[PDB]
Amino acid sequence: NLEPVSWSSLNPKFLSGKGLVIYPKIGDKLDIICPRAEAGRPYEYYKLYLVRPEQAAACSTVLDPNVLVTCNRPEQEIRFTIKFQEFSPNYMGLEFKKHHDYYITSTSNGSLEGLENREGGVCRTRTMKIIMKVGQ
Amino acid sequence: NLEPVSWSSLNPKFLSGKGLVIYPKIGDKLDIICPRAEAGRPYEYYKLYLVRPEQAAACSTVLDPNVLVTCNRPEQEIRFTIKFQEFSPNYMGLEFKKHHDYYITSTSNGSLEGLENREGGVCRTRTMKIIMKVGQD
Amino acid sequence: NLEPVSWSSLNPKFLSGKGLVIYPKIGDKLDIICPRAEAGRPYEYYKLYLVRPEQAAACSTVLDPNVLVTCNRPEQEIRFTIKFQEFSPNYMGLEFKKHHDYYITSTSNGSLEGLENREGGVCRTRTMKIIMKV
Amino acid sequence: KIFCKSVSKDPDFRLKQIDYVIPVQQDRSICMNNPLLDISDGFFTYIHYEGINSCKKSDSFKVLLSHGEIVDRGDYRPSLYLLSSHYHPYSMQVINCVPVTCNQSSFVFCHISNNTKTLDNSDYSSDEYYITYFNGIDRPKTKKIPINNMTADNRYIHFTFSGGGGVCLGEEFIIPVTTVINTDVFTHDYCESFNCSVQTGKSLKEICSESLRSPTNSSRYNLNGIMIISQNNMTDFKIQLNGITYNKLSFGSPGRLSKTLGQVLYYQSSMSWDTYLKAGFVEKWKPFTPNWMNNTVISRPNQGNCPRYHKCPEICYGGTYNDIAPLDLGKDMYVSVILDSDQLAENPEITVFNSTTILYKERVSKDELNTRSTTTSCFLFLDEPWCISVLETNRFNGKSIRPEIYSYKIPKYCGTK
Amino acid sequence: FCKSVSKDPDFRLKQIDYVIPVQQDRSICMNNPLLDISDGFFTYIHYEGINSCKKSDSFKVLLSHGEIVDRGDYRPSLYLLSSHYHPYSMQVINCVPVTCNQSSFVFCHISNNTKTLDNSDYSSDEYYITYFNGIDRPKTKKIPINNMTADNRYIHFTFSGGGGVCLGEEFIIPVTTVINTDVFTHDYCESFNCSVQTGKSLKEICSESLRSPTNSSRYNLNGIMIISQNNMTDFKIQLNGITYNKLSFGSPGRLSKTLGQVLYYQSSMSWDTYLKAGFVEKWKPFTPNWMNNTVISRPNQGNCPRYHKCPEICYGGTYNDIAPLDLGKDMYVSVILDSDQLAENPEITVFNSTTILYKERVSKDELNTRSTTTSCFLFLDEPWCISVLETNRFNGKSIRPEIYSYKIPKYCGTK
Numbered sequence A: 001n002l003e004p005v006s007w008s009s010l011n012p013k014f015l016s017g018k019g020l021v022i023y024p025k026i027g028d029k030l031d032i033i034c035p036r037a038e039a040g041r042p043y044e045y046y047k048l049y050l051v052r053p054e055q056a057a058a059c060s061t062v063l064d065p066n067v068l069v070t071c072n073r074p075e076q077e078i079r080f081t082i083k084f085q086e087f088s089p090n091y092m093g094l095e096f097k098k099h100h101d102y103y104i105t106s107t108s109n110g111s112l113e114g115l116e117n118r119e120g121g122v123c124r125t126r127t128m129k130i131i132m133k134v135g136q
Numbered sequence B: 001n002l003e004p005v006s007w008s009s010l011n012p013k014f015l016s017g018k019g020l021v022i023y024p025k026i027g028d029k030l031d032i033i034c035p036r037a038e039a040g041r042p043y044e045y046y047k048l049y050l051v052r053p054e055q056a057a058a059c060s061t062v063l064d065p066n067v068l069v070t071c072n073r074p075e076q077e078i079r080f081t082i083k084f085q086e087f088s089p090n091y092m093g094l095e096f097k098k099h100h101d102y103y104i105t106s107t108s109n110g111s112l113e114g115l116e117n118r119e120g121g122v123c124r125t126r127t128m129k130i131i132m133k134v135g136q137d
Numbered sequence C: 001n002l003e004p005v006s007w008s009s010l011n012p013k014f015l016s017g018k019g020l021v022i023y024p025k026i027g028d029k030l031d032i033i034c035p036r037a038e039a040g041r042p043y044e045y046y047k048l049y050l051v052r053p054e055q056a057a058a059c060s061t062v063l064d065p066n067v068l069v070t071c072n073r074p075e076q077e078i079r080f081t082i083k084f085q086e087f088s089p090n091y092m093g094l095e096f097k098k099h100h101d102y103y104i105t106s107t108s109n110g111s112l113e114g115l116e117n118r119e120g121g122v123c124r125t126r127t128m129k130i131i132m133k134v
Numbered sequence D: 001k002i003f004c005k006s007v008s009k010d011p012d013f014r015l016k017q018i019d020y021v022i023p024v025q026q027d028r029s030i031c032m033n034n035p036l037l038d039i040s041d042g043f044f045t046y047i048h049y050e051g052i053n054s055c056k057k058s059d060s061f062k063v064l065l066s067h068g069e070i071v072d073r074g075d076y077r078p079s080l081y082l083l084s085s086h087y088h089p090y091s092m093q094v095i096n097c098v099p100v101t102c103n104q105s106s107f108v109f110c111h112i113s114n115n116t117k118t119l120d121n122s123d124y125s126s127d128e129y130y131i132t133y134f135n136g137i138d139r140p141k142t143k144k145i146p147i148n149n150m151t152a153d154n155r156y157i158h159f160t161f162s163g164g165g166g167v168c169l170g171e172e173f174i175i176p177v178t179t180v181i182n183t184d185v186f187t188h189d190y191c192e193s194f195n196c197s198v199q200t201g202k203s204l205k206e207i208c209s210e211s212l213r214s215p216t217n218s219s220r221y222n223l224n225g226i227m228i229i230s231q232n233n234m235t236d237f238k239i240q241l242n243g244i245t246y247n248k249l250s251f252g253s254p255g256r257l258s259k260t261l262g263q264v265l266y267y268q269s270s271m272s273w274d275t276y277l278k279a280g281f282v283e284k285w286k287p288f289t290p291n292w293m294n295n296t297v298i299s300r301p302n303q304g305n306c307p308r309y310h311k312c313p314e315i316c317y318g319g320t321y322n323d324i325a326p327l328d329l330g331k332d333m334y335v336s337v338i339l340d341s342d343q344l345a346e347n348p349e350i351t352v353f354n355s356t357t358i359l360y361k362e363r364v365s366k367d368e369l370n371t372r373s374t375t376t377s378c379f380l381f382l383d384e385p386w387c388i389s390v391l392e393t394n395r396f397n398g399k400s401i402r403p404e405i406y407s408y409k410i411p412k413y414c415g416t417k
Numbered sequence E: 001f002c003k004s005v006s007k008d009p010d011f012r013l014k015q016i017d018y019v020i021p022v023q024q025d026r027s028i029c030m031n032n033p034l035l036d037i038s039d040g041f042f043t044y045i046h047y048e049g050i051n052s053c054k055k056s057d058s059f060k061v062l063l064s065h066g067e068i069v070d071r072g073d074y075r076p077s078l079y080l081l082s083s084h085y086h087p088y089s090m091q092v093i094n095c096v097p098v099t100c101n102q103s104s105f106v107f108c109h110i111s112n113n114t115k116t117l118d119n120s121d122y123s124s125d126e127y128y129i130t131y132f133n134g135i136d137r138p139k140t141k142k143i144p145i146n147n148m149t150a151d152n153r154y155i156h157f158t159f160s161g162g163g164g165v166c167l168g169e170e171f172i173i174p175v176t177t178v179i180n181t182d183v184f185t186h187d188y189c190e191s192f193n194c195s196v197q198t199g200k201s202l203k204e205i206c207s208e209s210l211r212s213p214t215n216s217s218r219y220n221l222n223g224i225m226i227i228s229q230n231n232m233t234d235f236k237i238q239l240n241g242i243t244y245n246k247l248s249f250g251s252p253g254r255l256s257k258t259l260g261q262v263l264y265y266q267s268s269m270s271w272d273t274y275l276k277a278g279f280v281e282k283w284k285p286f287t288p289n290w291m292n293n294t295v296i297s298r299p300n301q302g303n304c305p306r307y308h309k310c311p312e313i314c315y316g317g318t319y320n321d322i323a324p325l326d327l328g329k330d331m332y333v334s335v336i337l338d339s340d341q342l343a344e345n346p347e348i349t350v351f352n353s354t355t356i357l358y359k360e361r362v363s364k365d366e367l368n369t370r371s372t373t374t375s376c377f378l379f380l381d382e383p384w385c386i387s388v389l390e391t392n393r394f395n396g397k398s399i400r401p402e403i404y405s406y407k408i409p410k411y412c413g414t415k
């Protein structure tokens, strides 16, 4: 198991320049909680895409990136558990393997108006990208 | 009959350099008792290999050396009776004959973790090797 | 005399599974020529071990197996004559006698880098073993 | 008709793993994935894909096709005897295959294409479809299916054999297939009848129409169906393609047809919003109408907005394939290796269940085991009900991934351990 | 005849010395004898080697054909008729005798590699039938293993046993097969309530105990070979494996025609040190009705000596044929070794499934004996037996097996 990652604009683990770097070994669990209705009633709506390093640097996604998980409900604690095995019950396989890199980001505008804004968004403004270089 | 050889790391008959040499005649009995549960609870697990002089000197075994006897149970007094007759009930015949040499060793680590470690082990650290030159003196 | 056995990876007498078996009687000659410099200049470097059947199957040699003959020079046709007499001018005696088994192999990689490779080599890749039940 | 049919704990399935059927690759980069198994009349057909450093189906350089037999070894249990094993001649172009064991022989129905994404940008006239068939003695032979002389009940634009097995009825083969069509010709009374929270974006009629769309082609829809192939001893083929009933539609997904207990059972993997078991016996063939069960206890894990036990309509994609096998028709009993996890594909459990209650279950492994899909087939052996399941396992970490076969017996008595 | 527990039985034991040849070379060891008797004719086989008693390490293999003849002695005598050496003796891995239709038949496995069973396959080796009688010169025909059908994925095999059986036009020979995958179950072994070894579990212990001790990747499984033919023409060869019920590591077996039934014996070279034997119920799969014998075992060194019961990764044992005398009274006779670990003190033993009825030592002095074979038959309306013992009475000098003839005692306790 690993430390779950609360995915909100009010989370310190996202370094201002490097994002959130993780070095998970094979066979580890890792939760990615999208936040509940936060105390402050700031409805936080995101849409996460499994992406490649190049377009994660450019912070743009074409139609081919698959909507990994969407934080639709504000009240319900929607989540996304990860085990770094090869097989995943997700469309398009999403093989984790070993000695690879895995980047998770959101390009969305903070609210539901830009929920499906895929052009820019949080990927560069707040740099909320989870980068997982598995292995040493 | 001959004097049995207790096979434990606490046995003096294993000379620090020459091991334990025996000169038995044909038709002699000789037991090789692997020890019971010792007092101080030092569980002793070994696996004995009938070997050739060259790899008994080098203290390494390939797959062909036959597991002569293994000291599996710690409580039960496992043993191994030997008569130096020609015919033996062991796989691969194992004729004793006369004026031959017969070498017995173990490559095992002290505990069960390296029970089947065949690279080094007790053969060179403590030199617990039994060499049996049949003949008179 | 017997038919010499050319020792190269390019020899058909080495059956793909059974190696090369010979049934020589006592007092016969038998040469084992290690190859000259082949035409296409593919330098063939081996190191032959007189071995026992047990480690001949596993194709591994410890330090005690004696390097029977080594194919150092590529141009010079180095060879190895055998008479199946008892006495031989070799270190460690090498008594032939009769009704015995005698296995000769090489664990070497094709080239000089693995000349002294004793772990695997041609003994299992090409099964170039000479087995002699006299 | 003499086995445990009640709610009980600690069942004795007499579980044993079979390792000698599926080959073991020496190369660590090989992924053995997507296993399929179909048993019929004491013979089986096993299929799986092999790829290099990737376990994706069309990303496979070898596709193994195995034919075999069930044999008694005096073991008081059935044993798998592998008879023939061949590689597909067009493996590097295989998009999907479905096995059928007909008349004690193996038959493999495959779709071959130059484009691994052919279902998103092409049509079936641009691809080829083959039947590879063989047994224990004859060399495998592959014949091209004449899709030109095919009759269809609707304006389908594409199709692939997708499922865990097919069925032989007389001289006709019935293979599960997933079709692609680019116009909304469907109705959704069942989905539109749900009393769920209305999503602020779209209406329920829009949600239900769009949930049938391909997730990679907003203009295409994936609809399940069957293919009926009749022929005169591999001559003068007559091929028909019929779609599934519009009652309780679910997004196109690999299915299965099985001959069990004198009936024909259809299974559909739940890859959309209805995360509960889609299965049923076939009433009519045109349209392909399975009598859908009202199962309230069998589901499957998935990440995202539709995890295990999700019921409400939602534009979702993802899920796991988990075959079922009927045990008693009168008692409405079934067995299946399902995944005991809400979102992750792990912890396979042999589960004997009702339509309304789970009867008994057992984990396959004491350690955590990754399993993406399971298939199960049951049959009478020595006057007793026995079952064999195949799991696409990853027991070693990463590396050489390979499925596993397990054999087990339905417990004679309840609560024996 | 005597069917009760008693002492001092009168077997009228007599040794036969004129059958087995006497080699002039004192260094030669004559080892591994085999004997099969049928319809008053016998077939004897043994191996001859120089300063070594190993089977494949043999330069001569003797094959003898003979007849049972009455000499007016009120007991059977062995009459040696023909005696020849196998043409491929220096390449013989194993042979099995069968006396069919009053003639001798020898089924041998020949290979250039004495370790063929550890690193090769059966396509690389050859298998022959040598047959002859009292008048015809011996003829050797090669068995077409190419036209053989097998019930499983065997990679190698050798004729291994003390005898075979002739049924009509079919020969049934005991065989030990080789396979490179663990296709076996061990419900019988897994059912034992024994001390758990601290290293591995019982399922692992029982799986691994079927492996070859010299090739960790290989498994040795016993079975039979059925060879039917039209007067050495149009061979039909079938290879069937033994039942998975009560599996024991591959070992030399035997098939014998006795008392209207077919008895299979399997030497106990693993953890189950008690007698493995039984009559054949079905042929596919090869199912012998295993006996539940609690009194007959054999000596062996190592972790499985005499009377050892618990599953354990063991290898070793002695071959000791049995012969039924009366099936209803469940009586059997066998020359077993009365020692826990050493191969010595052979004893003719008439026994129950649950009790030993009576016994007698073969020699009053200690006698080394590596294996025994026994065959019984009706002679003068009485049950008589002939046994061959792989003896070593002259320690240090040459080795030669011994033949004994004896009668089941008519009355109990007569001396």
Ligand SMILES: *[C@@H]1O[C@H](CO)[C@@H](O[C@@H]2O[C@H](CO)[C@@H](O[C@@H]3O[C@H](CO)[C@@H](O)[C@H](O)[C@@H]3O)[C@H](O)[C@H]2NC(C)=O)[C@H](O)[C@H]1NC(C)=O
Pocket (backbone or CB within 6 Å): B063, C057, C058, E118, E119, E120, E155, E180, E215, E216, E217, E218
């Ligand atoms: C112990 O016994 C096993 C089986 O009895 C031996 O394993 C098998 O050995 C054979 C050769 O004797 C291997 O066959 C070769 O495999 C290569 C693989 O590419 C192939 O190219 C050759 O044409 C030939 O078929 C076989 O592969 C091997 N088993 C497996 C599963 O691969 C083993 O070598 C024996 N070991 C010792 C030390 O005796």
Ligand SMILES: *[C@@H]1O[C@H](CO)[C@@H](O[C@@H]2O[C@H](CO)[C@@H](O)[C@H](O)[C@H]2NC(C)=O)[C@H](O)[C@H]1NC(C)=O
Pocket (backbone or CB within 6 Å): C021, C022, E088, E091, E110, E111, E112, E126
């Ligand atoms: C054992 O090895 C020898 C090695 O020569 C084999 O002898 C030759 O085998 C080939 C092909 O099998 C035949 O064409 C030759 O005729 C054989 N030699 C002679 C002199 O006839 C031999 O066949 C192998 N097997 C046996 C059983 O001997």
Ligand SMILES: *[C@@H]1O[C@H](CO)[C@@H](O[C@@H]2O[C@H](CO)[C@@H](O)[C@H](O)[C@H]2NC(C)=O)[C@H](O)[C@H]1NC(C)=O
Pocket (backbone or CB within 6 Å): D120, D121, D182, D217, D218, D219, D220
């Ligand atoms: C999504 O599917 C639609 C429907 O087929 C595709 O649109 C067709 O594309 C083909 C090939 O480019 C054209 O020949 C057709 O004229 C298009 N229209 C129709 C109605 O078929 C669309 O290209 C697909 N999206 C992709 C491939 O990204």
Ligand SMILES: *[C@@H]1O[C@H](CO)[C@@H](O[C@@H]2O[C@H](CO)[C@@H](O)[C@H](O)[C@H]2NC(C)=O)[C@H](O)[C@H]1NC(C)=O
Pocket (backbone or CB within 6 Å): E231
């Ligand atoms: C079995 O086959 C053998 C060999 O083919 C037969 O023996 C010979 O057959 C020929 C016929 O061409 C006769 O002329 C010979 O006299 C036969 N030899 C002997 C020694 O009789 C034999 O007849 C066949 N049938 C059997 C043995 O029953």
Ligand SMILES: *[C@@H]1O[C@H](CO)[C@@H](O[C@@H]2O[C@H](CO)[C@@H](O)[C@H](O)[C@H]2NC(C)=O)[C@H](O)[C@H]1NC(C)=O
Pocket (backbone or CB within 6 Å): E289, E290, E291, E292
């Ligand atoms: C030794 O005990 C076993 C165990 O009961 C006996 O095996 C039975 O054999 C009969 C023979 O037809 C079968 O019907 C039974 O099914 C077997 N038992 C089981 C549990 O399956 C065996 O018969 C006994 N030995 C003898 C000589 O009878």
Ligand SMILES: *[C@@H]1O[C@H](CO)[C@@H](O[C@@H]2O[C@H](CO)[C@@H](O)[C@H](O)[C@H]2NC(C)=O)[C@H](O)[C@H]1NC(C)=O
Pocket (backbone or CB within 6 Å): E005, E328, E329, E330, E352, E353, E354, E355
């Ligand atoms: C040997 O097995 C037989 C069964 O085949 C046992 O049979 C009877 O046991 C009683 C018990 O004392 C005896 O009185 C009988 O004489 C035995 N025989 C018969 C035909 O009934 C016998 O008990 C077993 N041997 C021993 C020593 O008990």
Ligand SMILES: *[C@@H]1O[C@H](CO)[C@@H](O)[C@H](O)[C@H]1NC(C)=O
Pocket (backbone or CB within 6 Å): A109, A110, A111, A112, A113, A114, A115, A117
């Ligand atoms: C994000 O995009 C939407 C698209 O309509 C826009 O309305 C909104 O102002 C943008 N910025 C936000 C939500 O902060």
Ligand SMILES: *[C@@H]1O[C@H](CO)[C@@H](O)[C@H](O)[C@H]1NC(C)=O
Pocket (backbone or CB within 6 Å): B109, B110, B111, B113, B114, B115, B117
């Ligand atoms: C023996 O082998 C084990 C294998 O784990 C190793 O840990 C140990 O250090 C070795 N030596 C011992 C036990 O002396």
Ligand SMILES: *[C@@H]1O[C@H](CO)[C@@H](O)[C@H](O)[C@H]1NC(C)=O
Pocket (backbone or CB within 6 Å): C109, C110, C111, C113, C114, C115, C117
């Ligand atoms: C053989 O061994 C040598 C040892 O240095 C190695 O360099 C070489 O790559 C090996 N293989 C060959 C020569 O094919």
Ligand SMILES: *[C@@H]1O[C@H](CO)[C@@H](O)[C@H](O)[C@H]1NC(C)=O
Pocket (backbone or CB within 6 Å): D005, D006, D007, D354, D355, D356, D357, D359
């Ligand atoms: C199966 O379902 C029926 C009703 O659907 C129910 O009455 C029965 O109790 C269930 N089975 C068990 C074992 O509870």
Ligand SMILES: *[C@@H]1O[C@H](CO)[C@@H](O)[C@H](O)[C@H]1NC(C)=O
Pocket (backbone or CB within 6 Å): D102, D103, D169, D170, D171, D172, D233
């Ligand atoms: C298979 O069996 C059915 C039985 O009805 C028969 O009609 C058919 O001709 C057989 N052969 C094939 C190829 O289906």
Ligand SMILES: *[C@@H]1O[C@H](CO)[C@@H](O)[C@H](O)[C@H]1NC(C)=O
Pocket (backbone or CB within 6 Å): E100, E101, E166, E167, E168, E169, E170
């Ligand atoms: C032996 O005799 C029987 C009948 O007498 C016959 O069927 C058989 O073919 C003969 N030959 C052999 C080898 O059994």
